[PDB]
Amino acid sequence: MTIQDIQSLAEAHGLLLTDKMNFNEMGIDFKVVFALDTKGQQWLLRIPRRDGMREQIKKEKRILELVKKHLSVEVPDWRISSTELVAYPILKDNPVLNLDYEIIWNMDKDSPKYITSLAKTLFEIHSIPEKEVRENDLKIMKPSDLRPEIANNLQLVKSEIGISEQLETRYRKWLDNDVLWADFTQFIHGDLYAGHVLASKDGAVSGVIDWSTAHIDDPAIDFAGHVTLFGEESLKTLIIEYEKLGGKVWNKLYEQTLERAAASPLMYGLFALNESLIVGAKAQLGV
Numbered sequence: 001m002t003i004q005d006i007q008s009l010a011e012a013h014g015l016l017l018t019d020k021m022n023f024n025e026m027g028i029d030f031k032v033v034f035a036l037d038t039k040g041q042q043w044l045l046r047i048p049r050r051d052g053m054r055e056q057i058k059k060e061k062r063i064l065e066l067v068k069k070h071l072s073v074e075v076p077d078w079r080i081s082s083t084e085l086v087a088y089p090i091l092k093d094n095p096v097l098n099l100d101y102e103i104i105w106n107m108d109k110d111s112p113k114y115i116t117s118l119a120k121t122l123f124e125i126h127s128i129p130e131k132e133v134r135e136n137d138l139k140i141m142k143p144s145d146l147r148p149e150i151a152n153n154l155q156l157v158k159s160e161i162g163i164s165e166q167l168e169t170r171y172r173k174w175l176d177n178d179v180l181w182a183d184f185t186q187f188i189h190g191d192l193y194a195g196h197v198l199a200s201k202d203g204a205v206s207g208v209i210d211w212s213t214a215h216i217d218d219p220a221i222d223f224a225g226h227v228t229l230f231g232e233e234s235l236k237t238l239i240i241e242y243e244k245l246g247g248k249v250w251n252k253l254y255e256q257t258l259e260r261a262a263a264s265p266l267m268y269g270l271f272a273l274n275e276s277l278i279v280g281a282k283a284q285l286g287v
């Protein structure tokens with residue numbers, strides 16, 4: 001999309017933009033634009049790639065309104081949120097990392113403030129009450145629903161895209177160990193990793209950016225994005241700090257997280273069902 005097209009689309013929503021912008025396509029279903037308005041204010045624009053996304057946009061608007069109350073980090077403040085344009089003022093800090101693909105870290109990987117601040121944020125997110133989640137017509141998995149639905153995902157992935165025989169055995173084992181699965185499921189961001197976490201250079205986590213995925217689900221899923229990028233020792237430090245704050249853990253949180261992470265290619269496939277290049281990338285990461 002051209003700058004002038006973007007300017008016109010924003011002007012159709014009463015947002016008057018300069019021609020100074022930069023772009024981000026690392027996202028999946030929306031086009032992202034860093035824009036600047038005629039008043040000097042920096043904006044983040046999310047342009048739906050497709051028509052018919054109204055229900056997702058409304059859902060995420062609800063989620064942001066809901067989580068805004070319960071957190072001490074910034075979240076996007078949607079000022080425009082039609083089916084044609086989502087827009088909010090850019091948040092305070094830049095993401096911990098960017099991806100081209102290739103990781104471009106923006107803070108020191110070993111930043112210790114990141115662990116304590118991230119643990120605080122995970123605690124706040126995971127404290128949000130279930131009645132509010134359900135009120136907002138959000139998806140509610142409960143631990144009884146967890147295992148057979150992941151079984152269904154195995155089913156729909158193996159035949160549709162193929163699965164590694166080793167990948168299949170692990171996933172069947174993981175569903176097997178009743179010990180790994182938590183007694184309790186709590187509201188989760190659902191798409192949480194350093195690329196969606198905003199922080200200063202010292203690693204103090206200022207904000208969380210993409211909330212469309214958030215629903216009540218297993219706690220480990222919020223943990224897994226972290227262990228993939230910072231490693232297992234980091235993860236353990238995060239678990240500790242998280243518990244110290246008062247976060248609901250169980251005896252196998254760490255290992256369940258490890259299994260969630262290992263199950264990345266599986267949930268990759270199932271969400272891919274869409275694009276042939278994403279199906280290609282999965283198929284590789286799965287066989």
Ligand SMILES: CC[C@H]1OC(=O)[C@H](C)[C@@H](O[C@H]2C[C@@](C)(OC)[C@@H](O)[C@H](C)O2)[C@H](C)[C@@H](O[C@@H]2O[C@H](C)C[C@H](N(C)C)[C@H]2O)[C@](C)(O)C[C@@H](C)CN(C)[C@H](C)[C@@H](O)[C@]1(C)O
Nearest residue numbers: 028099101191192193213221224225228229264267268271
């Ligand atoms: C540490 C860097 C790596 O990062 C990761 O591995 C992440 C922790 C991983 O994420 C991990 C962890 C976790 C918790 O997501 C944060 C989990 O849901 C998934 C499936 O895998 C990402 C976010 C996944 O992308 C997520 O795939 C979901 C199915 C949809 C979701 N979004 C669009 C709603 C999307 O962000 C994905 C499936 O890996 C994207 C895929 C298309 C491209 N990957 C293969 C790249 C090359 C990555 O390997 C990586 C960038 O090099």
Ligand SMILES: Nc1nc2c(ncn2[C@@H]2O[C@H](CO)[C@@H](O)[C@H]2O)c(=O)[nH]1
Nearest residue numbers: 024027032044090091093094195209
């Ligand atoms: N600096 C910054 N980047 C953002 C913000 N919102 C989204 N992004 C980027 O846009 C991508 C898709 O949402 C993210 O992965 C970030 O890189 C924001 O408020 N600030």
